[PDB]
């Protein structure tokens, strides 16, 4: 169906479906064709709604800038097929959002709820976590060095530090690591009535757990995010638990896999470019540039969706009210109008105006926490390594949402 779809079926299938994202050489050439030939065009494949695919850096920014025109709330902000979206709606009392997180909201609601924590996530505030992050980073570096020159960088190291950081930011104690892992890896990881029961049950268990903290921080405040949210008010009243608990989940889930995935990306980049490892070791001031290149090149968030709320024009295309739009951050990050030799990992790349954290109204709340923890982590790691190389191929997550490296088998020499 839909006569406006011009993107060839094989191209559309590659960029929309999950499987392709397990392989850089499948996905990136498909987006390169789109950027060259059909930068912003409509695809319609079986099992999915018709959608515009924003492949250009300029277009992703322009759309992201305008939440009044391009909505997160009206449709699913996550790229589900029609079956899975139907399942989500039936579970969530009709609406296309599992929980009441920031990415489900439009202004002014979004502005209000984002505003509750926005200052806390700014660099000057985040800077106070440096000492705790340093300790956490060193612990992860240490458990890597406990291996005799061989391990999986993801499962044996990078899986842990970003979760512990996000736990420290929230105020979840170290001993709750198993539960938080269940949250991010099991529950939020990649019959019908039975699955619906397990879901409501699981989310209720996590919400009950989180409510314990909300209650605690109203009597015993701390400098963490739970305490900030528990004691926040709007119109002279506490924020409804559903918004608070969604905030805790959104922070933990958005903060863990993305950061681990990008760290893995860095290691892949450095293993394939040993000259750059030597560069980062000789000049540790380059590490923030290394961190930005890792995020650009890895681009662990593959897509978010928008719904057009009115008829409008982007790159001379007539986007109708109700039209769905896929924002491809990976494609924007390899846009040749912005980046020279985009497929190359290069830590000296400056400026590095990538869209790995998105752009506009919903731009990653955690970006400064992410950059700080990755910086600190690599500051601690790189001095301890003489060399690093891949021992086998990296395994990428087969997902069109939050993917990138899941396994990065490596060998290393200790400095
Ligand atoms: C390399 C690390 C990370 C990447 C690549 C990343 C990427 C993204 C992207 C693409 C978005 C959507 C932006 C948009 O729609 O314009 C986003 C949103 C968000 N991220 Fe991150 N993120 C990272 C780390 C973190 C961390 C560490 C946290 C929290 C501690 C976090 C919390 C969030 C939240 C709360 C949102 C939703 C903000 C909103 O809807 O207004 N992220 N992130
Ligand atoms: C990057 C990120 C991934 C998870 C999102 C969700 C679905 C928890 O709101 C929030 C933002």
Query: In 3D, which of 30, 94, 103 has the Cα closest to residue 301?
Result: 103
Tokens for 296? 């650009």
Evaluate: CB of 405 within 6 angstroms of ligand 1.
no
Evaluate: CB of 303 within 6 angstroms of ligand 2.
no
The angle subtended at Cα 402 by Cα 228 and Cα 50, nearest 5°, is 115
Residue of 253, 258, 397, 400 with the most ligand 2 atoms within 8 Å of its CB, for mutation: 253
Binding site listing: 364
Tokens for 224? 């963490």
Evaluate: CB of 103 within 6 angstroms of ligand 2.
yes
Q: How far apart are CA 182 and CA 7, in angstroms?
A: 39
Q: In DSSP terms, which residues pair with 49 in a beta bridge?
A: none
Evaluate: CB of 227 within 6 angstroms of ligand 2.
no
Tokens for 326? 């896929």
DSSP one-letter string for 332-389: HTT-TTT-SSTTS--TT--S----TT--STT--TTHHHHHHHHHHHHHHHGGGEEEEE
385 C-beta neighbours (distance < 10 Å), count: 20
Residue nearest to atom 21 of ligand 1 (CA): 364
Query: In 3D, which of 248, 184, 178 has the Cα closest to residue 211?
Result: 248
What does DSSP say about strands 324-328 and 51-54: parallel, antiparallel, or unpaired? Answer: parallel
314 Cβ neighbours under 8 A, 6+ residues apart: 40, 54, 59, 62, 63
Evaluate: CB of 116 within 6 angstroms of ligand 1.
no
Q: Contact 349/257 with Cβ under 8 angstroms?
A: no
Evaluate: CB of 107 within 6 angstroms of ligand 1.
no
Q: In DSSP terms, which residues pair with 409 in a beta bridge?
A: 152
Q: Which ligand is nearest to the CA of 266?
A: 1
Structure letter (DSSP) for residue 10: H
Q: In DSSP terms, which residues pair with 395 in a beta bridge?
A: 407
Q: Which ligand is nearest to the CA of 329?
A: 1
Q: How far apart are CA 169 and CA 32, in angstroms?
A: 39
Q: In DSSP terms, which residues pair with 54 in a beta bridge?
A: 40, 327
Binding site listing for heme: 364
Q: CA of 388: how far to CAs of 150, 232, 276, 288, 406, in Å?
A: 10, 46, 11, 19, 18
Evaluate: CB of 180 within 6 angstroms of ligand 2.
no
Q: Tell me the torsion sign for CA atoms 85, 90, 91, 95.
A: positive
Ligand 2 centroid – CA 149 distance (Å): 35
Q: Which ligand is nearest to the CA of 371?
A: 1
* CA dihedral of residues 199, 204, 209, 213 (deg, nearest 10): 120
Q: Which ligand is nearest to the CA of 247?
A: 1
DSSP run (H or E) holding 249? helix 241-272
Residue of 244, 288, 295, 364 with the most ligand 1 atoms within 8 Å of its CB, for mutation: 364
SS3 80: coil
Locus of tokens 């105006």: 353
Phi, psi of 343 (to 5 degrees): -75, -15
Q: Contact 158/260 with Cβ under 8 angstroms?
A: yes
Evaluate: CB of 249 within 6 angstroms of ligand 1.
no
Q: Contact 347/293 with Cβ under 8 angstroms?
A: yes
What does the domain layout of the chain look like in residue ranges? 1-415
226 Cβ neighbours under 8 A, 6+ residues apart: 170, 171, 172, 210, 213, 214, 217, 248
Query: In 3D, which of 247, 208, 205 has the Cα closest to residue 230?
Result: 247
What does DSSP say about strands 385-390 and 312-314: parallel, antiparallel, or unpaired? Answer: unpaired
Ligand 1 centroid – CA 67 distance (Å): 16
Evaluate: CB of 114 within 6 angstroms of ligand 1.
yes
Q: How far apart are CA 261 and CA 70, in angstroms?
A: 28
What does DSSP say about strands 40-43 and 51-54: parallel, antiparallel, or unpaired? Answer: antiparallel
Q: How far apart are CA 90 and CA 183, in angstroms?
A: 22
171 Cβ neighbours under 8 A, 6+ residues apart: 213, 217, 222, 224, 225, 226, 227
DSSP one-letter string for 141-183: HHHHHTSSSEEETIIIIITTHHHHHHHHHHT--GGGHHHHHII
Q: How far apart are CA 368 and CA 47, in angstroms?
A: 37
Residues in the chain: 415
Phi, psi of 412 (to 5 degrees): -145, 155
């Amino acid at each position: 169906m839909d006569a406006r779809a011009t993107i060839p079926e094989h191209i559309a299938r590659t960029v929309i479906l999950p499987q392709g994202y397990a392989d850089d050489e499948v996905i990136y050439p498909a987006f390169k064709w789109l950027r060259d030939e059909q930068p912003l065009a409509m695809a319609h494949i079986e099992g999915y709604d018709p959608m515009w695919i924003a492949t250009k850096h300029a277009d992703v920014m322009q759309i992201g800038k305008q939440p009044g025109l391009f909505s997160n709330a009206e449709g699913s902000e996550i790229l589900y097929d029609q079956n899975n979206e139907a399942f989500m709606r039936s579970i969530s009392g009709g609406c296309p959002h599992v929980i009441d997180s920031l990415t489900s909201m439009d202004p002014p609601t979004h502005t209000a709820y984002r505003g509750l924590t926005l200052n806390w996530f700014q660099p000057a505030s985040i800077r106070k976590l440096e000492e705790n992050i340093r300790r956490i980073a060193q612990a992860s570096v240490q458990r890597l060095l406990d291996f005799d020159g061989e391990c999986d960088f993801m499962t044996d190291c990078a899986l842990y530090y970003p979760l512990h950081v996000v736990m420290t930011a929230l105020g979840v104690p170290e001993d709750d690591e198993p539960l938080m892992l269940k949250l991010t890896q099991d529950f939020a990881g990649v019959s019908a009535d039975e699955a619906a029961r397990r879901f409501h049950e699981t989310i209720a268990t996590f919400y009950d757990y989180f409510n314990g903290f909300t209650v605690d921080r109203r009597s015993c405040p701390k400098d963490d995010v739970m305490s900030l949210l528990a004691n926040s008010k709007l119109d002279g009243n506490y924020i409804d638990d559903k918004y608070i608990n969604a905030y805790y989940v959104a922070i933990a889930t958005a903060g863990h896999d993305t950061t681990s995935s990008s760290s893995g990306g860095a290691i892949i980049g450095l293993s394939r470019n040993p000259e750059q490892l030597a560069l980062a070791k000789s000049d540790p001031a380059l590490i923030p540039r290394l961190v930005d290149e890792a995020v650009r090149w890895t681009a662990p968030v593959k897509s978010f969706m928008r719904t057009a709320l009115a008829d409008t024009e982007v790159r001379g295309q007539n986007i109708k009210r109700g039209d769905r739009i896929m924002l491809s951050y990976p494609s924007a990050n390899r846009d040749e109008e912005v980046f020279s030799n985009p497929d190359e990992f290069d830590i000296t790349r400056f400026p590095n105006r990538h869209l790995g954290f998105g752009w506009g109204a919903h731009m990653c709340l955690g970006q400064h926490l992410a950059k700080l923890e990755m910086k600190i982590f690599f500051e601690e790691l790189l001095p301890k390594l003489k060399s690093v190389e891949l021992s086998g191929p990296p395994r990428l997550v087969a997902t069109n949402f939050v993917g990138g490296p899941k396994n990065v088998p490596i060998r290393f020499t200790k400095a």
